[PDB]
Design a protein around this ligand. Structure first.
Ligand SMILES: C[As](C)(=O)[O-]
Ligand SMILES: [Zn+2]
Ligand SMILES: [Zn+2]
Ligand SMILES: [Zn+2]
Ligand SMILES: [Zn+2]
Lengths: 330, 329
């Protein structure tokens, strides 16, 4: 209603403050952090880096992050709770599915996946009593048959709980349209849906069209634009070629179209990553040493220079996430 | 050298007794049992079912099972420890990889995979201090590039620690020769390798030639048969269309060729399954109500009736697994 579930329990809407709506403590795989913590140096080393990173974001104004790591991204909510306490930053946990479901998940029906997402929202994650405050889904291309199952289960869990849905759009193929078609077929309100990674395209008319329909637009990979690395071929399939200012101008463009209320902004950062080639974390930290503080330290000042008023920036970073996350069936 | 790691700690090879070398408490995926236990009704219900089944096996003479569930098969070694203790049956845990590695595993180098396998053998699984006593690997058809990394890491781990390797092939497949090539290229002794699910075909030429090279032959899916379940595409794809007697006759055939010392026998049973279609566990329990007791209760006397001496059967069910499991550098 007016309360959001975090890994430290419920908080009221006003407590959320400046919120980054798409982040990760660790990008991994189910079971991996507990089976092979030394991959990250140690669990303690990962925890400590994440606490410093969160404290840095906090000093830059951030009060809440949404960790949209799912089961199959190796989400460890006990780790989230630990670093949230030590850094005094709220963390909202996620249910849903990313792009690496194991057999025990890939073989499930839409009704089974609905029950899974529901248990993580209504009951808790694993045996921790920590409840998810968001549902995350991922698609590739035009949306695969299994991904459509996931999208429908997500819609149904959202409809039962009021908790919103956030998507990973991995396509050069105006990937939102097919997502929206499926969500709407299920009776889900666009206002419960963020179409994420929308800063991956320059297709403004496409983004504006979604915004006009009531979808939230996730401009949430701003620092992955990067710059400089064409020597590592596996650094263009995780970063990019456009500049971060180019991505950030999409924020101004949507504002100018009159859809400031539809925008969510984030870094899609993390403090550890195992679901990619070894040492990619070091490359990422080199390119973006600001980490999760990139949005408040770089993008916000950049927008202010481009004439975006304080109140509009506060609306995007405080009010929109608050309205989005607050569980709602209207 | 004479001590085997179990989920309750070290045991002497004399204490292992009648050993089933290829079994599962639960066939699942990494993290799945702890994220969604109510898929199995509850964790408590799964544990209770495993203990009832293990106790029936114990009654039938079974003293040790080897749970060859890997990380990616959802191995929960805390569950293994709980049901081992309650059933009072030794359970040897596994490291290695099966057919569902996640990205964080699929993208690793042969050196990294070797370190992971060594961790689970030398240090312990997760934070439990429970050490693996066997390395499990799996292939599908022609060994994929990634599967070849897994096989080489398994060989390197086995050579460093002396614990044996056990392999999977898919339903009705014959990949031992492919696997053996890679293992031997790493300098691994065939006596440290069990070519598993070798009862999937009746290619006796294939079986005897591996045996002649010193490989253990895993005739380990004996009760798996979908005879009478022809309308069920999922069951038949899983269990196959060959009778348990047909599978069991391969044990006799290899004995008759003089290879009794190379034979390992098991059920490849499990008490919960999430890594396949829903409610497949109920179908399998209907097929084989004996569960893991199927080998001592049905296969052993079947072979007795075919004239195999009791001492040969004891050699296969006790001595062979002991020689196999005992760490040898
Ligand atoms: C769990 As199996 C059928 O790969 O031995
Ligand atoms: Zn994403
Ligand atoms: Zn992400
Ligand atoms: Zn197998
Ligand atoms: Zn098996």
């Amino acid at each position: 209603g007016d309360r959001i579930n975090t890994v430290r329990g419920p908080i009221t809407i006003s407590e959320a403050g400046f919120t980054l709506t798409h982040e990760h403590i660790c990008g991994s795989s189910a079971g991996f952090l507990r089976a092979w913590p030394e991959f990250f140096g140690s669990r303690k080393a990962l925890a400590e880096k994440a606490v410093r990173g969160l404290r840095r974001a906090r000093a830059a104004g951030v009060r809440t992050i949404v960790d949209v790591s799912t089961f199959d991204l190796g989400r460890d909510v006990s780790l989230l709770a630990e670093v949230s306490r030590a850094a005094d930053v709220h963390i909202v946990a996620a249910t849903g599915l990313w792009l690496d479901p194991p057999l025990s998940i890939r073989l499930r029906s839409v009704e089974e996946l609905t029950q899974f997402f529901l248990r993580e929202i209504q009951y808790g994650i694993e045996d921790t009593g920590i409840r998810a405050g968001i549902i995350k889904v991922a698609i590739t291309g035009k949306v695969t048959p299994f991904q459509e199952l996931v999208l429908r289960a997500a819609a149904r869990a959202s409809l039962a709980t009021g908790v919103p849905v956030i998507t990973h759009t991995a396509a050069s193929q105006r990937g939102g349209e097919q997502q929206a078609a499926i969500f709407e077929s299920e009776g889900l309100s666009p206002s419960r849906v963020c179409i994420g990674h929308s800063d991956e395209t320059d297709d403004l008319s496409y983004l504006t069209a979604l915004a006009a329909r009531g979808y939230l637009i996730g401009l949430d990979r701003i620092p992955h634009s990067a710059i400089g690395l064409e020597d590592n071929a596996s650094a263009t399939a995780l970063l990019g070629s456009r500049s971060w200012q180019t991505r950030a101008l999409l924020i101004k463009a949507l504002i100018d179209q009159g859809y400031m209320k539809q925008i969510l902004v984030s870094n899609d950062w993390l403090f550890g990553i195992s679901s990619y080639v070894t040492n990619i974390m070091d490359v990422m930290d080199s390119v973006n040493p600001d980490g999760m503080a990139f949005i408040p330290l770089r993008v916000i000042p950049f927008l202010r220079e481009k004439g975006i008023p304080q109140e509009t920036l506060a609306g995007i970073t405080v009010t929109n996430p608050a309205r989005f996350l607050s569980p709602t069936l209207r």
